[PDB]
Design a protein around this motif. Structure first.
Motif, mmCIF file in Angstrom:
data_model
loop_
_atom_site.group_PDB
_atom_site.id
_atom_site.type_symbol
_atom_site.label_atom_id
_atom_site.label_comp_id
_atom_site.label_asym_id
_atom_site.label_seq_id
_atom_site.Cartn_x
_atom_site.Cartn_y
_atom_site.Cartn_z
ATOM 1 N N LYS A 12 0.823 -1.204 0.000
ATOM 2 C CA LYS A 12 0.000 0.000 0.000
ATOM 3 C C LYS A 12 0.861 1.259 0.000
ATOM 4 C CE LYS A 12 -4.155 -1.968 2.134
ATOM 5 N NZ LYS A 12 -4.890 -1.535 0.914
ATOM 6 N N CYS A 16 2.683 4.685 -3.238
ATOM 7 C CA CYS A 16 2.681 6.123 -2.965
ATOM 8 C C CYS A 16 4.044 6.760 -3.100
ATOM 9 C CB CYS A 16 2.144 6.402 -1.549
ATOM 10 S SG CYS A 16 0.502 5.708 -1.262
ATOM 11 N N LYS A 97 -3.478 4.988 -6.746
ATOM 12 C CA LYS A 97 -3.173 3.951 -5.770
ATOM 13 C C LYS A 97 -3.255 4.451 -4.332
ATOM 14 C CE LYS A 97 0.355 2.018 -8.940
ATOM 15 N NZ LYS A 97 1.790 1.635 -9.041
ATOM 16 N N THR A 98 -3.821 5.634 -4.107
ATOM 17 C CA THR A 98 -3.953 6.159 -2.751
ATOM 18 C C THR A 98 -4.739 5.190 -1.876
ATOM 19 O OG1 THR A 98 -3.948 8.410 -3.611
ATOM 20 C CG2 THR A 98 -4.625 8.103 -1.316
ATOM 21 N N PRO A 99 -4.181 4.737 -0.765
ATOM 22 C CA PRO A 99 -4.927 3.889 0.163
ATOM 23 C C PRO A 99 -5.740 4.767 1.105
ATOM 24 C CG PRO A 99 -2.730 4.256 1.020
ATOM 25 C CD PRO A 99 -2.820 5.038 -0.269
ATOM 26 N N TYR A 101 -6.008 6.306 4.529
ATOM 27 C CA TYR A 101 -4.848 6.722 5.311
ATOM 28 C C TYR A 101 -5.223 7.782 6.334
ATOM 29 C CZ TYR A 101 -4.360 11.161 2.732
ATOM 30 O OH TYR A 101 -4.593 12.381 2.145
ATOM 31 N N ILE A 152 -0.366 -0.196 9.785
ATOM 32 C CA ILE A 152 -1.573 -0.506 9.027
ATOM 33 C C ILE A 152 -2.573 -1.135 9.974
ATOM 34 C CG2 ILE A 152 -2.546 -1.525 6.962
ATOM 35 C CD1 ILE A 152 0.072 -1.678 5.709
ATOM 36 N N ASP A 155 -7.216 -1.961 6.583
ATOM 37 C CA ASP A 155 -7.132 -1.349 5.266
ATOM 38 C C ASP A 155 -6.601 0.072 5.303
ATOM 39 O OD1 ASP A 155 -9.459 -0.728 6.697
ATOM 40 O OD2 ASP A 155 -10.521 -0.123 4.881
ATOM 41 N N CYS A 156 -6.343 0.618 6.487
ATOM 42 C CA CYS A 156 -5.990 2.024 6.657
ATOM 43 C C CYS A 156 -4.520 2.156 7.038
ATOM 44 C CB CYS A 156 -6.875 2.666 7.725
ATOM 45 S SG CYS A 156 -6.579 4.424 7.983
ATOM 46 N N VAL A 157 -3.777 2.943 6.264
ATOM 47 C CA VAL A 157 -2.367 3.211 6.552
ATOM 48 C C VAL A 157 -2.259 4.469 7.410
ATOM 49 C CG1 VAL A 157 -0.039 3.604 5.616
ATOM 50 C CG2 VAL A 157 -1.758 2.173 4.317
ATOM 51 N N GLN A 306 -4.725 -6.163 4.179
ATOM 52 C CA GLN A 306 -5.204 -5.955 2.802
ATOM 53 C C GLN A 306 -6.292 -4.883 2.738
ATOM 54 O OE1 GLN A 306 -4.508 -8.955 -0.518
ATOM 55 N NE2 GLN A 306 -3.568 -6.979 0.001
ATOM 56 N N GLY B 11 4.972 -5.850 -2.005
ATOM 57 C CA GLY B 11 3.795 -5.588 -2.826
ATOM 58 C C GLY B 11 3.636 -6.551 -3.987
#
Lengths: 306, 306
Positions: A12, A16, A97-99, A101, A152, A155-157, A306, B11
């Motif tokens: 993830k 970035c 591809k921004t997760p 966050y 992480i 799903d959140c960085v 994930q 990744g």
């Protein structure tokens, strides 16, 4: 079974990472939505770093002076601003591809994963802790500035660290993602000495619980202690004083193993006073302090993301 | 500066990880092009594992008995076959995230990164070495089978390990991606004892070079030695005998530091005979042996991938 120093999966964050060049300086940036974050000393020359006036140095920069590259593709810089010690470069394309966050400012003793990068490309990933003197013990070569640290949660960085500086003693300093340095350090090549590197007691205790869960039990002793008596020994060995907040955080590991927190403190006390006698715990010949209680719970239960 | 146990960015491998269920057993698979690789003991029950006849157990399975899930999406299994100790499940969709890749069978002493997964979802990444008794010291809980080990060279993922078994002593055994176990181990829940865990001498020496590059020099001594004299001490401490092939592999680190390989052997000899005296090297209180020479060169030079 087994216990390893384990980093978060890095995919993830890999998505970035970009390269930022200004003049002849190249380092790494973090591309989230339509903003690239990077250390403001990308605008400095080697000479500038001895006494930089960042506001004046930035007068001589325009949007087109910042070359931002994602892989082999140029991003278009349409705005820039300084926030504390980071630059925010607005680009005309949101990172696809921004997760999910968050930006988090962590406390000493808290751990995180570092994705070491050079020229915008990931090198490796490893685990670190914010020390109580507000350094980290990283692995950073020339060009690694702007590499980030993160945690992480599913799903959140949560981004907590951006790398800026190597002190003359070889330890590392940096900022949160709002650009505020951890501790007293500054982005200037000057005499900056680190304070006492105290051992993160609650993390050592968490790791001893991890050892017990895995069958390493030789160090368990016949004693208990109190917080005040343990802490008299903690101070002598430059350990952080243990608080009732720390005891509470160890509650779940205490319940799983049936070993009371103060009983484990008394085993730690014996380990500090007598040493390890050439023995090992979880393969280590010293008392490890960069696993948090939550780290231990994770690795011993199998939390995924994930 | 700084030296850390550092895994490869994960990744490229995260995008290959799937969940495989057969009957009531769920573990991880690796999805590359239109094939999913997984341990063949996905077809076994808990009772089956005490004495499994895999050929007979597989007669009772058809394509539709293998449930393969990538995230929240079902893959369609259109063929299956057993290759040694892995199953190859042909699916009707090539993985769009397939990286460039190779299957490699590694030698003892060689290191790799493990992406620990549960239910097809990555948990964490850490570094390991193939031991000389053909175990690895991993961190694997129930459901981690099918997690893989890998190396990355720029853009190419070399897969070298698939996790299958935990021995009663807590160490780990598995196969290459052609399904052949490393060492003598078998996918049966039986008495399997590991042989001597000899220390990987050439890796210890590489790590001592890494220490010198970083300024840890206290252990450098006034002596040199010969291969045969060093090895008499290596055998007594259960170190692997050093060969001229190993000396040659350390050549570049010898040239960078100006410390002759046999001079560093004599410092290692003193460390084995006298111990470390409560001192540390690169933050470690023991002699680390899961950095290869190539690992050290990488981390000290900043090799990147993507």
């Amino acid at each position: 079974s087994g216990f390893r120093k384990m980093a978060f999966p890095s995919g993830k964050v890999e998505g970035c990472m970009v390269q930022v060049t200004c003049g002849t300086t190249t380092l790494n940036g973090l591309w989230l939505d339509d903003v690239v974050y990077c250390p403001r000393h990308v605008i400095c020359t080697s000479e500038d770093m001895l006494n930089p006036n960042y506001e004046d140095l930035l007068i001589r920069k325009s949007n087109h002076n910042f070359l931002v590259q994602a892989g082999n593709v140029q991003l278009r810089v349409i705005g820039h601003s300084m926030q504390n010690c980071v630059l925010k470069l607005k680009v005309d394309t949101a990172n696809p591809k921004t997760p999910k966050y968050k930006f988090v400012r962590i406390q000493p003793g808290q751990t995180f994963s570092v994705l070491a990068c050079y020229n915008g490309s990931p090198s490796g990933v490893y685990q670190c802790a914010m020390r109580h003197n507000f350094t980290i013990k990283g692995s950073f070569l020339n060009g690694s500035c702007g590499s980030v640290g993160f945690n992480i949660d599913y799903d959140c960085v949560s981004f907590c660290y951006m790398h800026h500086m190597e002190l003359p003693t070889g330890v590392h300093a940096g900022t949160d993602l709002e650009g505020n340095f951890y501790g007293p350090f500054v982005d200037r090549q000057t005499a900056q000495a680190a304070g006492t590197d105290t051992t993160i007691t609650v993390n050592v205790l968490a790791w001893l619980y991890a050892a017990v869960i895995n069958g390493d039990r030789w160090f368990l002793n016949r004693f208990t202690t109190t917080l005040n008596d343990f802490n008299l020994v903690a101070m002598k060995y430059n350990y952080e004083p243990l608080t009732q907040d720390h005891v509470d955080i160890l509650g779940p590991l205490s319940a799983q193993t049936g070993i009371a927190v103060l009983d484990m403190c008394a085993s730690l006390k014996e380990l500090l006073q007598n040493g390890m006698n050439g023995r090992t715990i979880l393969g280590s010949a010293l008392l490890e302090d960069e696993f948090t209680p939550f780290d231990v719970v994770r690795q011993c239960s199998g939390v995924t993301f994930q």
